[PDB]
Symmetry: C2
Subunit: 248 residues, 2 copies
């Protein structure tokens, strides 16, 4: 059985005070023992969160670069994350692919480098509304996955969670239907079976992201190839706990 | 003139907890010229540690920030987070962000205006590539990059700006500009400021040089009249950073 996985990406939000309050809310929450929970604060708040958050929730960075060190003003290395005791990193998120132009190869290089230096990776993929309307959903997400698959080894995949996030569902309030999400997750898993291995396909979590909230997460969690969620803005609000508990 | 000598240390993507403690300890124990304004810029994940432990006469800079107060910008740091952490400075427009991460002049200008409006001071980086200099475009490039900021900010905003001229061909290459080459561009930048902002902004804005500066060449550069200090890359991780802070004594 694939362990249910809920990631909370806080994006560019938070102060010391509101993050202390948010961590307090998590430290007091009754969480489904069967969910693996990860939260991703802003880089500058990674020490505050790692020091004070309950140890059964792990911490992620929101981005990292491709080299161990160097003349890369404004970038964080996977080595700094490991030095600070941050075990996860979100990579390839739609906001970085679009606003900051990160290419499929760039995201692949980050993934390979993060995995080789001890990090676990939430790998984000997903098609735009235009690509869907053109009938290109599968072509796009498999192209995005293939860039990673061509660089990492079969055993690397054990440290990867795949987040499928339709760009048209991110922050828009237009959630994929359970049938739409399931169709793409099933096709991602089939692709993994035919290009990496059956074992990778069977064991890799494929989580869904894009306007997941308290009211729709339970039905989404019932789908057989949906292994959890990547949550954006709801991750800052108390309904993050309901989403963690979507299998109850 | 009355322009206070300014030395900025950009650590870029370098450091661990232990190597940063040692770097800060070395700075904390140094004898530093009282007339030098010193700023150091750690990776964002180390901003708390450095701000907590560094002697308070050295201020701290972030190496970048975004254009908005908050929102759905995975991987970005805002000006508000910086003020919340007590980080008073930010470096914007560094060549590496222009060339590797595609930051436009306007994008840099947006960040510059937003930082200044939310209580930050800005080290603003400008500079021409080797190929632009070979087409005789040095002045055109650096004034174009400056004008994008000037079109957005007010005359009083400039009191919180330090301009760092870094010829891209001098960054990390070991090919430092000669004192004459640096002085020529700094004079042109200051002339541009007098013609397009005001005489007073021209007279008071620090224009600092960056590019392969080290303990062995900083004193001669600091003698040039329109060079008001340094933005130091690789040498800011080493003890000779102290010697650069002390380049005028």
């Amino acid at each position: 059985a694939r362990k249910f996985f809920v990631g909370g990406n806080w994006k560019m939000n938070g102060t010391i005070e509101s993050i202390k309050s948010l961590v307090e809310t998590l430290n007091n929450a009754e969480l489904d023992d069967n969910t693996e929970v990860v939260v991703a604060p802003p880089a500058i708040y990674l020490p505050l969160v790692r020091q004070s958050l309950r140890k059964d929730i792990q911490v992620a960075a929101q981005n990292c670069y491709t080299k161990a060190s160097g003349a890369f003003t404004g970038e964080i290395s996977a080595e700094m994350l490991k030095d600070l005791g941050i075990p996860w990193v979100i990579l390839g998120h739609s906001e970085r692919r679009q606003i900051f132009g990160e290419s499929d190869e760039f995201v692949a290089e980050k993934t390979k480098y993060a995995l080789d230096n001890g990090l676990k990776v939430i790998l984000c993929i997903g098609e735009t509304l235009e690509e869907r309307e053109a009938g290109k959903t599968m072509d796009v997400v498999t192209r995005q996955l293939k860039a990673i698959a061509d660089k990492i080894s079969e055993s690397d995949w054990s440290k990867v969670v795949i987040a499928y996030e339709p760009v048209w569902a991110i922050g828009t309030g237009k959630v994929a239907t359970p049938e739409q999400a399931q169709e793409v997750h099933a096709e991602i898993r089939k692709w993994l079976a035919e290009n990496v291995s059956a074992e990778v396909a069977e064991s890799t979590r494929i989580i869904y992201g894009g306007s997941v909230n308290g009211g729709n997460c339970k039905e989404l969690a019932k789908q057989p190839d949906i292994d959890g969620f990547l949550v954006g803005g709801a991750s800052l609000k108390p309904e993050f706990v309901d989403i963690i508990n979507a299998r109850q």
